[PDB]
Design a protein around this motif. Structure first.
Motif, PDB file in Angstrom:
ATOM      1  N   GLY A 360      43.169  41.233  37.352  1.00  0.00           N
ATOM      2  CA  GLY A 360      41.937  41.300  38.128  1.00  0.00           C
ATOM      3  C   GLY A 360      41.611  42.702  38.586  1.00  0.00           C
ATOM      4  O   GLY A 360      41.737  43.656  37.815  1.00  0.00           O
ATOM      5  N   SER A 361      41.233  42.834  39.863  1.00  0.00           N
ATOM      6  CA  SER A 361      40.845  44.097  40.504  1.00  0.00           C
ATOM      7  C   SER A 361      41.937  45.162  40.606  1.00  0.00           C
ATOM      8  O   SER A 361      41.640  46.309  40.931  1.00  0.00           O
ATOM      9  N   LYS A 364      41.192  48.159  38.444  1.00  0.00           N
ATOM     10  CA  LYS A 364      40.252  49.154  38.953  1.00  0.00           C
ATOM     11  C   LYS A 364      40.846  50.577  39.133  1.00  0.00           C
ATOM     12  O   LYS A 364      40.239  51.477  38.557  1.00  0.00           O
ATOM     13  N   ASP A 404      31.093  40.372  43.526  1.00  0.00           N
ATOM     14  CA  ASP A 404      31.457  39.081  44.136  1.00  0.00           C
ATOM     15  C   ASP A 404      30.352  38.412  44.958  1.00  0.00           C
ATOM     16  O   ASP A 404      30.234  37.189  44.932  1.00  0.00           O
ATOM     17  N   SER A 423      36.081  47.324  46.154  1.00  0.00           N
ATOM     18  CA  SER A 423      36.366  46.680  44.868  1.00  0.00           C
ATOM     19  C   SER A 423      35.081  46.114  44.221  1.00  0.00           C
ATOM     20  O   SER A 423      35.038  44.961  43.773  1.00  0.00           O
ATOM     21  N   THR A 550      43.820  45.011  46.318  1.00  0.00           N
ATOM     22  CA  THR A 550      43.823  43.550  46.245  1.00  0.00           C
ATOM     23  C   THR A 550      43.374  43.136  44.853  1.00  0.00           C
ATOM     24  O   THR A 550      42.699  43.897  44.158  1.00  0.00           O
ATOM     25  N   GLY A 551      43.752  41.932  44.464  1.00  0.00           N
ATOM     26  CA  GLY A 551      43.368  41.338  43.198  1.00  0.00           C
ATOM     27  C   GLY A 551      42.989  39.899  43.425  1.00  0.00           C
ATOM     28  O   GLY A 551      43.696  39.196  44.148  1.00  0.00           O
ATOM     29  N   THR A 552      41.836  39.476  42.879  1.00  0.00           N
ATOM     30  CA  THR A 552      41.327  38.104  42.961  1.00  0.00           C
ATOM     31  C   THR A 552      40.583  37.790  41.669  1.00  0.00           C
ATOM     32  O   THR A 552      39.399  38.120  41.536  1.00  0.00           O
ATOM     33  N   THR A 553      41.290  37.160  40.707  1.00  0.00           N
ATOM     34  CA  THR A 553      40.722  36.786  39.406  1.00  0.00           C
ATOM     35  C   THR A 553      39.628  35.733  39.563  1.00  0.00           C
ATOM     36  O   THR A 553      39.479  35.156  40.648  1.00  0.00           O
ATOM     37  N   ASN A 554      38.843  35.510  38.489  1.00  0.00           N
ATOM     38  CA  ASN A 554      37.743  34.544  38.498  1.00  0.00           C
ATOM     39  C   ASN A 554      38.251  33.130  38.733  1.00  0.00           C
ATOM     40  O   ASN A 554      39.282  32.741  38.165  1.00  0.00           O
ATOM     41  N   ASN A 556      39.455  31.969  41.675  1.00  0.00           N
ATOM     42  CA  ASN A 556      40.608  32.060  42.583  1.00  0.00           C
ATOM     43  C   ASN A 556      41.939  31.582  41.944  1.00  0.00           C
ATOM     44  O   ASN A 556      42.772  30.995  42.637  1.00  0.00           O
ATOM     45  N   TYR A 585      42.237  34.303  48.302  1.00  0.00           N
ATOM     46  CA  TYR A 585      41.747  35.613  47.883  1.00  0.00           C
ATOM     47  C   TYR A 585      42.937  36.569  47.914  1.00  0.00           C
ATOM     48  O   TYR A 585      44.026  36.167  48.333  1.00  0.00           O
ATOM     49  N   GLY A 586      42.741  37.795  47.432  1.00  0.00           N
ATOM     50  CA  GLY A 586      43.775  38.823  47.411  1.00  0.00           C
ATOM     51  C   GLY A 586      44.331  39.094  48.792  1.00  0.00           C
ATOM     52  O   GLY A 586      45.549  39.132  48.970  1.00  0.00           O
TER      53      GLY A 586
HETATM   54  C1  LIG Z   1      38.589  41.745  41.325  1.00  0.00           C
HETATM   55  O1  LIG Z   1      39.572  41.060  41.610  1.00  0.00           O
HETATM   56  C2  LIG Z   1      37.317  41.400  41.742  1.00  0.00           C
HETATM   57  N1  LIG Z   1      37.145  40.045  41.258  1.00  0.00           N
HETATM   58  C3  LIG Z   1      35.928  39.506  40.677  1.00  0.00           C
HETATM   59  O2  LIG Z   1      34.920  40.166  40.576  1.00  0.00           O
HETATM   60  C4  LIG Z   1      35.919  38.031  40.220  1.00  0.00           C
HETATM   61  C5  LIG Z   1      35.778  37.190  41.480  1.00  0.00           C
HETATM   62  C6  LIG Z   1      36.769  36.375  41.988  1.00  0.00           C
HETATM   63  C7  LIG Z   1      36.368  35.696  43.212  1.00  0.00           C
HETATM   64  C8  LIG Z   1      35.021  36.038  43.609  1.00  0.00           C
HETATM   65  S1  LIG Z   1      34.380  37.161  42.438  1.00  0.00           S
HETATM   66  C9  LIG Z   1      37.184  41.056  43.182  1.00  0.00           C
HETATM   67  N2  LIG Z   1      37.910  41.849  44.104  1.00  0.00           N
HETATM   68  C10 LIG Z   1      38.224  41.147  45.252  1.00  0.00           C
HETATM   69  C11 LIG Z   1      39.502  41.552  45.902  1.00  0.00           C
HETATM   70  O3  LIG Z   1      40.381  40.698  46.180  1.00  0.00           O
HETATM   71  O4  LIG Z   1      39.684  42.773  46.130  1.00  0.00           O
HETATM   72  C12 LIG Z   1      37.512  39.976  45.626  1.00  0.00           C
HETATM   73  C13 LIG Z   1      37.366  39.805  47.135  1.00  0.00           C
HETATM   74  C14 LIG Z   1      36.249  39.681  45.002  1.00  0.00           C
HETATM   75  S2  LIG Z   1      35.525  41.001  43.962  1.00  0.00           S
END
Ligand SMILES: *C(=O)[C@@H](NC(=O)Cc1cccs1)[C@H]1N=C(C(=O)O)C(=C)CS1
Ligand SMILES: C=C(C/C=C(/C)CCC=C(C)C)CCC(C)(C)/C=C/CC/C(C)=C\CO[C@H](COP(=O)(O)O[C@H]1O[C@H](C(N)=O)[C@@](C)(O)[C@H](OC(N)=O)[C@H]1O[C@@H]1O[C@H](CO[C@@H]2O[C@H](CO)[C@@H](O)[C@H](O)[C@H]2O)[C@@H](O[C@@H]2O[C@H](C)[C@@H](O[C@@H]3O[C@H](C(=O)NC4=C(O)C=CC4=O)[C@H](O)[C@H](O)[C@H]3O)[C@H](O)[C@H]2NC(C)=O)[C@H](O)[C@H]1NC(C)=O)C(=O)O
Length: 649
Positions: A360-361, A364, A404, A423, A550-554, A556, A585-586
């Motif tokens: 995920g993120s 970045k 997001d 992010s 932080t990382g949060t894939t599509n 959750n 979330y992350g």
């Molecule tokens: C990267 O993880 C980025 N994720 C996405 O764009 C896909 C999504 C997943 C849930 C809602 S959109 C996200 N980065 C964060 C993070 O944890 O830093 C998220 C809060 C959402 S944007």
């Protein structure tokens, strides 16, 4: 027929031949002993009194009021007194050292030998024995010569009960009695008990025999044979209803006494032993293996997993949730801790080495690191467009990535610094595409991730990169060290029984990305923790100045956190083994496990030492460099800050 006393006498000479071929050379196939990190205490080192007690307790040290035996310690208002147990260190073999550790706030002041009242340049701490590598016989032993056993333990054994020795050594009554009179005549009475104290059956570990007094003392109490109390000495002798037999030995020789492994980390250890030495190790007897393993970091990471996961399962009403934690040394890549699940004591599937998940993120920083590596074009104040994207894929599809919140900045632009901080997806693609995927893919190669996992498509910039937490730990260590890729290791040294160095670790760090780009990315990662996505950590630990992501894939399905302190790089993953929504979330998932991990120990504050050609520069609301003043101060990779003069005109 007096001939009989001649054929039985020749059998005695042909028995003396068998008691020679065995006792003169290899007596046993002694399994390889695995030890943790050897911590060297030093004056002015940043460690508190409470942090030292925890470090001692984790290294099998017992707190007492008055010291009598090694491996004991006393607690005072501003000091600690200890008898550092004898350890055969690879550098130099040492004995009993009565030492005092005097503290001043968060740092150690003096380490003074209590025998001569002299200061120490550095003081060695013995490592804790993690486990023993499974013997071919299944008979697990830890060899200790006669002298290593205390005089009291020997007397608790003598009596109750040479006759037993031969029974457990060569047999399945008259045969052993004949061998016993051959043995006692050839070898000294003290040599006889040395072999006896390392032969006797005392326990069972699954289907592996725990035999001999030194391994039994650790397998039952978690303390060496030398540091066994009389009640514990009696129990070890007695095992040769359980409470009754301990008291039975006590009455034979009172009322007070009668009233009284790492499956995730070892996967990496066994894998590294095979890669560095081969099949040459396993044959050799009594091998000593010295690891990078931290008992303090592990206990803290296990506690964060065992307590955090059920607390998250009850809060989000989850039927199943799993975690993975990898702790590595910021500068050397040494693996300090490894958690492959919510049950780190009882495990078969190591998520830290096997669970290949979308990052995920966490992908970045590679994009911004590639950008920040070009200081003549990309800086922190660099404006990135934040407007609807539409990219052409083969053949008829259109890739339209969204942020997001599915929103865009009112001005249609953001500064590079804020884009990574929050992010933001849309500007990350814009920056990543302007640099080009092969440039961003090259950064990943230099970060040390597996080459066969890199597919250079636009989705890569957002997290279409499936890695294990250990591979992510390698990538983040490279940025954290200041731009030096130190290949992750579990092994410090491999030593033979005869003291021969089979394998020795040496630094092999490689300059992957420039120091300035890595600093600028780390300083930006401090902003995510303080004011961006990881703000909940930054409010709880503001003085630690952590650099995180932080990382949060599509949908959750995966929550990731990459935390950097003054000494360690920690990668946390929280998700489901069925690749399903976690309602987390992350910040709420993996980061919550990292806070608990931070609370379960004493972390090192991150004070970023700026590398060469770093100048703090002022920018106006428009993002243009100003000579004096500015509403925002950003560090810039420049040897002559008069970029401001060029900007102001
Ligand atoms: C990267 O993880 C980025 N994720 C996405 O764009 C896909 C999504 C997943 C849930 C809602 S959109 C996200 N980065 C964060 C993070 O944890 O830093 C998220 C809060 C959402 S944007
Ligand atoms: O010659 C014979 C020899 O016969 P033994 O029966 O072997 O000798 C026992 O009796 C003696 C006696 N004459 O009174 C003795 C008391 O002097 C012995 O004690 C000694 N020599 O110092 C006593 O021997 C002991 O016998 C134990 C087993 O015998 C048990 O004795 C009880 C009362 O006497 C009986 O009630 C039991 O029925 C009887 O079994 C030896 O312990 C055994 O040591 C074995 C290696 C263990 O096998 C393992 O067990 C494991 C497990 O149980 N889990 C696994 O299954 C594993 O696969 C397996 O290999 C096994 O689990 C373990 N069993 C017990 C009760 O401790 C143990 O290893 C062995 N000790 C030594 C120093 O050699 C003799 O002199 O009698």
């Amino acid at each position: 027929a007096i001939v009989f006393a001649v054929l039985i006498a020749i059998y005695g000479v042909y028995l003396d031949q068998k008691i020679r071929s065995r006792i003169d050379g290899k007596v046993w196939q002694l399994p390889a002993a695995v030890y943790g990190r050897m911590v060297n205490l030093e004056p002015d080192m940043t460690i508190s009194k409470n942090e030292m007690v925890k470090l001692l307790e984790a290294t099998q040290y017992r707190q007492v009021s008055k010291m009598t035996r090694p491996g004991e310690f006393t607690v005072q208002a501003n000091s600690i007194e200890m008898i550092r147990r004898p350890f055969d260190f690879p550098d130099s073999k040492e004995g009993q050292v009565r030492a005092r550790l005097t503290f001043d706030g968060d740092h150690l002041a003096t380490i003074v030998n209590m025998e001569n009242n002299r200061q120490f340049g550095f003081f060695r701490l013995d490592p804790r024995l993690i486990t023993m590598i499974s013997s071919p016989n299944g008979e697990q032993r830890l060899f200790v010569p006669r002298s290593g056993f205390p005089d009291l333990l020997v007397d608790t054994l003598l009596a109750t009960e040479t006759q037993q020795l031969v029974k457990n050594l060569f047999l399945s009554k008259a045969n052993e009695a004949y061998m016993a009179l051959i043995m006692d005549a050839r070898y000294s009475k003290d040599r006889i008990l040395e072999l006896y104290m390392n032969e006797v059956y005392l326990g069972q570990s699954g289907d592996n025999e725990i035999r001999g007094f030194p391994l039994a003392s650790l397998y039952y109490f978690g303390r060496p044979v030398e540091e066994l109390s009389l009640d514990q000495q009696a129990l070890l002798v007695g095992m040769v209803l359980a409470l009754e037999r301990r008291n039975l030995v006590l009455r034979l020789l009172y009322d007070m006494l009668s009233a009284r492994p790492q499956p995730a980390f070892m996967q990496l250890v066994r894998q590294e032993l095979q890669a560095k030495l081969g099949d040459k190790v396993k044959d050799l007897s009594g091998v000593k293996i010295f690891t990078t393993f931290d008992s303090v970091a592990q206990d803290a990471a296990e506690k964060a997993a065992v307590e955090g996961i059920p607390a998250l399962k009850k809060q989000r009403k989850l039927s199943d949730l799993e975690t993975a934690i990898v702790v590595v040394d910021r500068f050397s890549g040494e693996v300090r801790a490894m958690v492959g699940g919510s049950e780190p004591q009882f495990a078969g599937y190591n998520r830290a080495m096997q669970a290949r998940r979308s990052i995920g993120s966490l992908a970045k920083p590679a994009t911004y690191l590639t950008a920040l590596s070009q200081p003549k074009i990309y800086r922190l104040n660099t404006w990135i467009a934040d407007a609807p994207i539409a990219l052409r894929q083969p053949n008829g599809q259109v890739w339209s990535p969204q942020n997001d919140d599915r929103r865009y900045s009112e001005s249609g632009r953001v500064m590079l610094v804020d884009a990574l901080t929050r992010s933001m997806n849309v500007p990350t693609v814009n920056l990543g595409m302007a640099l080009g995927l092969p440039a961003v893919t090259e950064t990943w190669i230099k970060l040390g991730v597996p080459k066969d996992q890199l597919h250079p498509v636009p989705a890569m910039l957002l997290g279409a990169l499936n890695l294990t937490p250990i591979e992510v730990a390698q990538a983040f260590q490279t940025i954290a060290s200041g731009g030096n890729r130190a290949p992750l290791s579990a092994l410090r040294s491999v030593i033979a029984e005869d003291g021969k160095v089979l394998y020795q670790s040496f630094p092999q760090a490689e300059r992957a990305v420039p120091a300035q780009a890595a600093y600028l990315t780390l300083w930006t990662m401090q902003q995510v923790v303080q004011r961006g996505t990881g703000r909940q950590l930054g409010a709880k630990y503001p003085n630690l100045h952590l650099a995180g992501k932080t990382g949060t894939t599509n949908n959750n399905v995966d929550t990731w956190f990459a935390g950097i302190d003054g000494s360690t790089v920690t990668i946390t993953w929280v998700g489901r083994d069925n690749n399903q929504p976690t309602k987390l979330y992350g910040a709420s998932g993996a980061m919550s496990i990292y806070q608990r991990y931070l609370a379960n120990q004493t972390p090192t504050p991150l004070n970023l030492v700026p590398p060469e050609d770093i100048a703090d520069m002022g920018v106006d609301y428009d993002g243009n460099f100003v000579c004096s003043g500015g509403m925002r101060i950003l560090p810039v990779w420049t040897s002559d800050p008069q970029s401001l003069c060029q900007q102001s005109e």
